[PDB]
């Protein structure tokens with residue numbers, strides 16, 4: 001006997017609870033992003049995480065305020081292209097130079113990746129990480145020369 | 153042995169006939185029962201059910217209704233939302249989960265009891281990337297329909313970071329197949345080299361609107377990610393001078409394969425005709441060819457294992473099935489020559505990453521095989537430039553004009569230098 | 575000249591593509607003028623270059 | 626030159642990375658002249674500990690074998706990565722190991738040793754020193770280490786006086802096939818037989834002074 005389900009907050013597990021909450025009538029409160037398929041007829045759910053059909057406009061506004069003509073979007077897992085899809089689609093309408101890269105596998109070694117970025121003269125980088133992963137990148141961008149006055 | 157029962161979870165078509173994957177599941181059980189030489193003293197029985205393809209709660213009930221009644225394998229709800237819900241049931245009970253449709257495996261699942269007979273897009277995105285370098289392209293215009301198609305092609309979006317390309321990713325409208333505002337902006341951008349990541353029901357719908365606009369010409373190339381490209385009505389587009397390159401895993405140059413497809417359309421007497429669909433006939437599409445191969449690869453595994461008694465596992469009191477860990481090791485180590493060619497599964501994953509594709513392309517006689525992709529080999533696109541009609545223009549122009557010229561100062565002498573010259 | 579009745583004029587329209595013949599005048603009735611454009615569309619001849 | 630246990634034996638002086646196996650430092654060159662000690666060669670039998678900055682095409686830190694002297698010598702492949710290489714017989718008696726190094730590395734290095742005994746089925750030595758000395762093409766037919774019309778590998782050896790530097794100037798220079806650096810040339814190696822110290826290589830009409 002409950003009145004609300006507050007979510008397992010993971011993509012494979014929230015979809016399992018969402019269809020139970022729809023069939024039984026109880027509301028499912030989701031607190032983390034989870035890509036629903038475009039034709040899921042689910043109605044008994046709310047989501048309090050900021051949608052990436054809005055957060056990917058705020059990143060795209062911020063690269064137009066800074067007058068960039070080249071970005072280097074770096075994500076970690078394959079779902080991160082959905083979290084930023086209004087930023088990948090951006091050179092189709094504007095004059096950006098989206099060069100999409102990816103972090104390595106289960107290891108936490110960005111030593112091969114960040115070296116190829118400074119050889120490509122990639123000084124404007126968008127990191128699609130968690131704050132635990134961004135702590136490891138910033139330490140590995142200090143051990144290299146990735147921390148001058150003209151990286152952003 | 154005896155009955156051994158297979159499970160099934162398929163489309164609930166409320167008005168029309170049974171689904172195309174559900175016929176091909178019943179057609180494959182009847183083929184193995186009649187043709188005795190596969191499973192001689194062993195017969196098969198099916199326990200198919202109906203879901204709404206999106207309610208994961210319904211696919212979870214119809215799985216435990218088959219697990220309680222007792223099956224040997226679940227043959228896939230064939231949708232990303234509901235296959236993930238049945239995959240985790242089959243892991244916690246022991247029974248395998250065979251699935252004939254692409255699905256985003258989240259990179260941190262610890263699921264072991266599944267095989268996927270659909271050609272995996274980590275291998276396919278190399279196959280398109282071999283084509284867009286074989287035609288010596290510099291700009292592409294990858295067009296998808298739903299947001300998961302960036303996962304299907306992520307080895308192609310990550311191409312300009314290493315190669316020399318220029319991705320200009322676009323998206324089709326929501327369902328709403330009038331994509332003429334999309335195609336109008338592709339004309340202004342001079343975007344002649346296009347990759348469509350959409351199904352053949354939508355790939356036959358964009359070409360009606362690439363023909364209603366001036367985009368089916370000799371300048372436009374089109375690569376399609378779908379494997380059902382042969383099942384398009386291509387009669388309006390055969391004379392346009394277009395190019396329509398694609399793949400085909402369905403092994404339609406074999407006598408054994410083509411005879412089953414002729415026996416398939418005989419069993420498709422319940423075919424709804426659609427003149428406005430832009431599709432040829434009730435061909436065996438590659439989503440229904442893989443369900444025919446799904447039954448046979450498991451039938452290899454029951455042939456090598458005559459100890460298999462179906463139990464009656466619950467879900468509220470879940471126990472690993474007694475023969476689940478061994479029978480799953482036979483499916484991942486089974487080879488078969490099905491209608492899609494060679495079926496072999498990757499031991500790390502359970503994903504078909506080793507498979508034979510046929511590069512078909514559009515010429516003025518219809519779709520014709522012009523090559524062959526293979527993961528170990530690459531493109532074997534032969535094409536030879538021999539078998540073509542006449543009237544090519546060649547200029548001899550031997551403007552070398554060999555001059556005989558001795559050295560004799562001041563007239564001819566070697567240039568004084570330290571570097572070598574030639 | 576168009577073929578005799580035989581409204582499949584694709585061998586005529588194919589030779590007009592090789593010649594780069596983008597400016598065309600049809601002296602035919604509208605029953606035949608609606609029949610050539612089905613075959614100027616089945617070939618790549620209803621584009622922005624052709625008048 | 627900070628490369629370590631390179632000191633050779635009867636064959637195969639074990640030819641490891643600089644400061645093996647601690648870490649090799651930033652930018653280095655060490656050329657590792659595989660002598661391929663006479664009647665034998667060296668087969669590069671790489672040890673298990675092998676990791677040098679894996680990248681695309683090994684445009685970064687890498688390793689070479691280069692069967693032949695230098696340059697035009699056919700490479701087997703580049704050797705960067707975490708797996709230990711194999712398949713070396715190296716039938717040439719004159720070899721080389723290029724180990725380049727970037728500025729921002731990891732990956733301690735490599736080590737390999739001899740495995741080639743058998744035999745394949747010139748000694749123009751010119752030891753001299755002093756304030757000057759005129760090495761000519763006249764002696765190469767007069768010292769009787771050559772034959773008219775055969776492939777020579779005759780190398781002049783220049784030793785300085787102690788605390789001195791060397792300045793080769795050309796008093797005469799004449800090639801019978803000008804601008805053809807395949808069949809006749811004069812190269813100037815500054816030290817041992819290494820492309821690390823190769824100031825100039827002349828096969829044209831005029832040879833500048835190094």
Ligand SMILES: *[C@@H]1O[C@H](CO)[C@@H](O[C@@H]2O[C@H](CO)[C@@H](O[C@@H]3O[C@H](CO[C@H]4O[C@H](CO)[C@@H](O)[C@H](O)[C@@H]4O)[C@@H](O)[C@H](O[C@H]4O[C@H](CO)[C@@H](O)[C@H](O)[C@@H]4O)[C@@H]3O)[C@H](O)[C@H]2NC(C)=O)[C@H](O)[C@H]1NC(C)=O
Nearest residue numbers: 274278282498500501503505527528529530531679680706
């Ligand atoms: C399924 O099982 C396969 C093997 O059974 C596992 O391997 C993946 O699949 C292929 C097989 O090699 C890989 O893709 C190919 O990689 C080749 C090079 O691989 C090395 O690359 C660098 C070398 O420096 C290393 O860092 C790396 O670790 C590998 O050792 C490429 O050469 C291929 O490109 C093209 O090259 C040939 C050259 O002739 C062409 O002919 C072909 O067209 C070919 O396309 C290609 O990129 C793949 O990378 C392997 N790994 C992964 C993670 O996918 C899989 O791991 C396993 N699982 C899955 C999900 O596939």
Ligand SMILES: *[C@@H]1O[C@H](CO)[C@@H](O[C@@H]2O[C@H](CO)[C@@H](O)[C@H](O)[C@H]2NC(C)=O)[C@H](O)[C@H]1NC(C)=O
Nearest residue numbers: 370393394395396397513514515522539540541
């Ligand atoms: C791309 O389309 C062109 C037509 O625009 C094809 O070229 C024609 O087909 C054969 C090749 O087998 C030639 O004999 C014809 O002469 C070609 N036509 C012209 C006008 O040159 C070409 O084969 C297609 N290529 C692919 C890969 O689909």
Ligand SMILES: *[C@@H]1O[C@H](CO)[C@@H](O)[C@H](O)[C@H]1NC(C)=O
Nearest residue numbers: 183184186187188189190408
């Ligand atoms: C059954 O399949 C086998 C395949 O080996 C072959 O003999 C034939 O296709 C079938 N035989 C009969 C009698 O149906």
Ligand SMILES: *[C@@H]1O[C@H](CO)[C@@H](O)[C@H](O)[C@H]1NC(C)=O
Nearest residue numbers: 153189190191192193194458
């Ligand atoms: C048929 O049944 C017999 C028992 O009578 C059994 O030994 C055999 O394995 C079965 N299968 C065959 C012959 O393929």
Ligand SMILES: *[C@@H]1O[C@H](CO)[C@@H](O)[C@H](O)[C@H]1NC(C)=O
Nearest residue numbers: 524529530531532533534535
């Ligand atoms: C490609 O196909 C031809 C036959 O068309 C075959 O002879 C050849 O071995 C295949 N492979 C390669 C790498 O050429």
Ligand SMILES: *[C@@H]1O[C@H](CO)[C@@H](O)[C@H](O)[C@H]1NC(C)=O
Nearest residue numbers: 754755756757758786787789
């Ligand atoms: C070089 O100079 C020393 C004295 O400085 C002299 O003894 C010697 O003979 C000279 N060298 C030669 C080759 O004459």
